[PDB]
């Protein structure tokens, strides 16, 4: 039962101008309005804006933790070096019927074809990492590309933003101006006064400022590290493009403004709860649920992760703290 590696570039469609692609038994085609998926025995359609926003995340996150559901049918499960792609795996209708379909891939093989899909299907003026009010539209025939938008380098602190050799603070000068929906956020540096010899370990930065300057939405990015404890804050606007079903607990601390989380059962997709978080609110997302957030105004969110690879197995024998 070895992980698959078979992927293929199919033809360009003459009318639409887009290329279609194959990964194992799945095929991917887009037209003016839709991503059209097929697999052995079934088919599915996702509006292309939702699809591209979702694909942007799975790509940027390297398949992330646990389950990335594009929607109630299609998604991926990260096995960390391998990845399952599914239609209906976490949908009771498909599963009670025996109509779910899963294929396990080597992660770099699936990632390579996902990157090609994302590049080909993204048009000039359309940034699938941005909120709708910040960017153009993906509809219609192929028209140029936005490869710059979809190839942004991941930033990850090794220990903390701003430390020597570590991920830098964001400034106008290094290409990171304050986003319009955080135009009022204070931007002063903390006062840092190190004695001679201790410059490298006396360090502080304006985290709210750094987040106010994030050039993408819904992208947890590590700012500070204590062993497996990762503080991954991010700037959120509109809707989280996926329903995340994590294979471990994760916590959200709302830093500004407000987000509402739609919480559904991880396995079935059934609605379970709705969590409203305002500035200072912290809550846990248990491993047995999937969640999707809604943020009207661009807001600052701390996603707190435990990146230990031992946790998933341990949950497969609690699911809540």
């Amino acid at each position: 039962s070895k992980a698959r590696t078979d992927t293929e570039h199919l033809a360009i469609n003459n009318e639409t101008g887009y290329r279609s692609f194959r990964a194992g038994g799945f095929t991917f085609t887009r037209d003016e309005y839709f991503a059209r998926l097929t697999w052995p025995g079934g088919s599915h359609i996702i509006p292309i804006d939702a699809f591209l926003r979702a694909m942007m995340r799975d790509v940027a996150w390297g398949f992330f933790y646990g389950v990335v559901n594009f929607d109630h049918v299609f998604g991926t499960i990260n096995h960390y070096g391998e990845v399952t792609m599914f239609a209906g795996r976490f949908n009771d209708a498909y599963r009670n019927a025996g109509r779910d379909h899963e294929e396990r891939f080597k992660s770099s093989a699936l990632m390579a074809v996902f990157k090609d899909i994302l590049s080909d299907w993204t048009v000039e003026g359309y940034d699938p990492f941005a909120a709708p009010m910040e960017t153009g539209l993906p509809w219609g025939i192929k028209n140029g590309n936005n490869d710059e938008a979809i190839s942004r380098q991941r930033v990850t602190a090794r220990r903390m933003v701003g430390l020597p050799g570590d991920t830098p603070v964001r400034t106008d000068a290094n290409g990171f101006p304050v986003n319009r929906q955080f135009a009022d956020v204070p931007q002063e540096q903390p006062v840092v006064e190190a004695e001679p010899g201790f410059e490298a370990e006396v360090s502080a930065y304006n985290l709210f400022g750094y987040l106010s300057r994030s050039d993408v939405t819904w992208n947890p990015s590590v700012c500070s590290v204590v062993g497996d404890s990762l503080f991954c804050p991010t700037s959120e606007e509109f809707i989280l493009p996926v329903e995340h079903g994590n294979d471990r607990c994760e916590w959200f601390l709302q830093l500004s403004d407000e987000i509402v989380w739609d919480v559904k059962d991880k396995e079935s997709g059934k609605p379970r709860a709705r969590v409203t978080a305002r500035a200072g609110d912290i809550c846990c997302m248990p491993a047995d649920i999937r969640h999707q957030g809604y943020s009207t105004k661009r807001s600052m969110l701390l996603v707190w992760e435990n990146g230990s690879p031992k946790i998933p197995q341990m949950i497969a024998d609690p699911v809540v703290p």
Binding site: Q181, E195, V226, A273, C283
Partner: protein
């Protein structure tokens, strides 16, 4: 005109859990400002836990005792000005067991070591609390702060209250 809403000890508006079919306890919902406002000064109350790792909420008020730790920690200032004073310990093993975890309170008295530096944090500023350093805080007015650490001797667990 754009207004980014941040919380404060004196001004927060807690959200909550709306149930369709679940147990609200599963979400362990709290507000870190409310938790800090209800704690003793510099008491480090766990508000998030994930195995051994914690987020702790605290209210800085006046001058704290000295702390040190067997691993790095981080402090994020959430409301009000907080000073961090750092001292490089001559023998950190004399003060913290290098196989312990979580901060250890090491006293009000100045520990033995060299002046490392001073940091003044305002709302939204994060500082490194590096392993091998002793640290303490000063806040002229009550201020909220958050720690990224591991559960240990100073971690207060108040899950019921």
């Amino acid at each position: 005109d754009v207004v980014t809403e941040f919380g404060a000890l004196t001004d927060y508006r807690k959200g909550g859990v709306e149930i369709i079919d679940d147990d609200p306890r599963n979400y362990v919902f709290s507000n870190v400002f409310e938790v800090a406002a209800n704690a003793a000064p510099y008491e480090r109350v766990a508000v998030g836990k994930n195995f051994e790792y914690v987020i702790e909420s605290a209210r800085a008020e006046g001058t704290s005792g000295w702390f040190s730790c067997a691993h790095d920690e981080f402090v994020l200032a959430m409301d009000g000005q907080i000073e961090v004073h750092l001292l490089k310990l001559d023998n950190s093993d004399a003060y913290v067991d290098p196989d312990s975890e979580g901060a250890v309170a090491i006293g009000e008295a100045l520990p033995e070591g060299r002046k490392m530096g001073r940091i003044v944090l305002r709302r939204g500023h994060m500082a490194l609390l590096p392993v091998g350093a002793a640290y303490r805080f000063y806040a002229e007015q009550p201020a909220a702060m958050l720690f990224q650490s591991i559960e240990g001797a100073v971690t207060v667990q108040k899950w019921g209250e």
